[PDB]
Ligand binder design. Sequence first.
Ligand SMILES: Nc1ncnc2c1ncn2[C@@H]1O[C@H](COP(=O)(O)OP(=O)(O)NP(=O)(O)O)[C@@H](O)[C@H]1O
Length: 295
Amino acid sequence: LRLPLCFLGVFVCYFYYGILQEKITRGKYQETFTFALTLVFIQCVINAVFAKILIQFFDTARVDHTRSWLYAACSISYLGAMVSSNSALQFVNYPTQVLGKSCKPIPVMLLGVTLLKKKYPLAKYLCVLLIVAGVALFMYKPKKVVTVGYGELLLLLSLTLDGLTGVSQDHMRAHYQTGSNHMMLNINLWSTLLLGMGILFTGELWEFLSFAERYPAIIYNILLFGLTSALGQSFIFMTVVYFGPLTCSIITTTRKFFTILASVILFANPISPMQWVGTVLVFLGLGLDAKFGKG
Ligand SMILES: Nc1ncnc2c1ncn2[C@@H]1O[C@H](COP(=O)(O)OP(=O)(O)NP(=O)(O)O)[C@@H](O)[C@H]1O
């Protein structure tokens, strides 16, 4: 049973996803792409329909034991995190976003330690040193010699909301014995409903066609971005059931490092050497916990 599709499928698709996301966000159209909610709405609905058409061809005996409200709260947290992350690209540069967003464990770790009252032996005190050193050497100058950018605040709030969603997921999985496809399916429906409800009130989507009228070449790319996102979500779901979940961490780390490399190469984003070694340090620490002492 050769399974090369476990690597290629989740690698090439997410690589195209990242390249498209960078293309349509920082594209020098002049009217910058200030709209951050429409694309996440489209992505959510596309991935939801793909989830339905996928579960239709999978096991049916499973019965969703999860209650309604937990999915709703997890959906608000998840959609808020995604919206805040995407809206921040107007200030910061792409490589900084994909690096900062990648340090997911630290928010979850601190939230669990302060709230869940957990314990981790010399693992959340050792790899954290490498992670924080890398982050605080890459984006930061030596001594602020050569108010912080508002995008950093948005990224920090995104990390906080993402940690909240993660802890919520952990609870609904442990104490309620939820599944994998059902969870993502329900949270997607709730998130898209809430996003649409808010959007119609915001008075922007009614005004969003005119922007499309200005540049008719912003429809195919966004559709492809949604399609690849949904395909990648389905592929990662299919992987996680095989070889356990530990492979997912290494897969994502490799994908994000190659995404950094492609971003710096293709789009000519300047980077300094002393800065450049910053990303490798944080990436090495990231996933090292998964390889040794998962936590
Ligand atoms: N059991 C799972 N394992 C991995 N990813 C999952 C799982 N369940 C849901 N996902 C989603 O799969 C995506 C993984 O991509 P990513 O945004 O990089 O998260 P990640 O934690 O950094 N990578 P990963 O360790 O595989 O979850 C996210 O959108 C997760 O919400």
